[PDB]
Amino acid sequence: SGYTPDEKLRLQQLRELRRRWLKDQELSPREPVLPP
Amino acid sequence: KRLFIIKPSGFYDRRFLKLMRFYILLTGIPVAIGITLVNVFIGEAELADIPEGYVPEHWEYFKHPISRW
Numbered sequence: 476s477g478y479t480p481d482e483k484l485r486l487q488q489l490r491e492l493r494r495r496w497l498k499d500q501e502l503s504p505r506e507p508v509l510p511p
Numbered sequence: 512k513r514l515f516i517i518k519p520s521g522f523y524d525r526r527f528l529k530l531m532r533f534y535i536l537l538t539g540i541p542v543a544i545g546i547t548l549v550n551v552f553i554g555e556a557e558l559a560d561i562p563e564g565y566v567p568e569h570w571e572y573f574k575h576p577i578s579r580w
């Protein structure tokens with residue numbers, strides 16, 4: 476029943492990485508740098 | 512909050528469409544203007560009977576000026 480310690484630790488590491496990746500998909504206030 | 516949208520590169524399709532439109536228009540806008548000018552200022556011939564003793568040229572059996580040319 477439940478996660479094994481390896482399963483839970485791997486899920487936590489993958490969760491941290493995925494959350495940073497999703498945070499990095501955000502746009503800075505100037506990202507659409509439109510040329511004239 | 513604004514997010515980045517992952518897409519395939521649309522630059523090349525857009526450039527191809529722009530080039531095809533440019534070349535088609537480059538040749539076909541002069542053709543349209545010329546056809547309009549010919550139609551307005553040199554209309555079609557009107558049908559007439561062949562006068563006595565007159566033998567027409569082979570292109571005188573058509574009425575549109577472009578077809579005659």
Ligand SMILES: CCCCCCCCCCCCCCCCCC(=O)OC[C@H](COP(=O)([O-])OCC(O)COP(=O)([O-])OC[C@@H](COC(=O)CCCCCCCCCCCCCCCCC)OC(=O)CCCCCCCCCCCCCCCCC)OC(=O)CCCCCCCCCCCCCCCCC
Pocket residue numbers: 531532535536539540542543546547548550551554555575
């Ligand atoms: C874009 C790039 C992307 C890729 C796209 C792919 C493109 C591929 C292209 C490949 C190459 C294309 C080549 C094709 C060759 C074809 C050329 C050709 O043979 O043309 C023949 C033909 C010309 O006829 P013609 O045999 O030469 O002339 C015989 C007559 O003697 C002439 O009659 P006329 O002398 O008495 O008329 C006067 C004269 C001039 O007309 C007038 O002056 C009178 C007009 C009437 C106006 C009246 C009122 C307006 C003014 C009112 C206000 C002012 C006065 C009052 C002011 C005071 C105000 C108070 O009329 C004309 O000359 C017509 C103009 C001809 C233009 C034809 C264009 C061909 C271009 C060839 C290359 C195409 C390249 C594409 C780019 C071209 C540019 C977009 O051209 C046309 O047919 C034009 C269309 C006309 C149709 C009218 C619309 C009726 C439609 C009804 C049916 C639809 C029902 C609904 C459908 C279903 C929906 C639900």
